[PDB]
């Protein structure tokens with residue numbers, strides 16, 4: 001996250017921290033994720049596509065710090081790693097950038113809701129906030145483009161939803177942004193998601209309810225003028241989510 005504020009998991013209790021283990025025993029952070037039910041985390045395909053082996057992954061819930069333990073945190077393995085069959089990446093644009101991780105504790109259980117671990121609601125078919133709406137993003141992503149390490153503490157910020165019409169302007173992304181994507185940015189270009197924020201939630205308060213409107217997907221640089229964050233439009237993927245979580 002560029003700009004914004006440090007935060008704690010209690011304010012973002014659906015946030016999942018996803019790591020990958022390496023031969024040698026080193027674990028690195030991979031991407032964000034959102035808990036949409038006790039057994040299911042949703043994230044972004046591009047996070048996993050080069051390493052589609054579920055055994056490599058570790059998911060934490062209730063975690064506020066990157067490399068240390070948070071009271072109440074819970075650790076999960078991945079029982080099923082589901083990538084979107086039609087995922088693809090162009091120079092900038094990532095398509096069908098959405099994934100599902102079925103989680104389970106070492107004892108075989110799914111998540112136990114608590115003060116710091118909660119599900120986030122999905123949106124309803126093609127019902128997204130209007131452009132100009134303020135929404136929040138959360139992640140352990142870079143604080144500056146020149147950074148090579150991630151912040152130790154979870155961050156959040158607030159960005160505004162940008163219309164498809166504006167986002168498809170030639171100085172923005174032209175036709176590379178599709179209707180299955182959502183653009184969001186700061187009107188002054190001072191705050192944004194960045195590398196390492198992928199897979200994490202774009203949350204909008206919709207009809208009184210906190211809704212998972214987007215998933216951090218792609219963009220050109222971070223907090224660049226005329227270059228919004230691009231998000232998977234969750235509301236266009238409800239039949240895919242339902243079909244894969246129904247089992």
Ligand SMILES: Cc1cccc(C)c1OC[C@@H](C)N
Nearest residue numbers: 193194195218219221222229
């Ligand atoms: C999400 C992401 C992943 C890799 C690279 C960049 C610049 C990224 O940020 C683009 C945009 C969200 N600011």
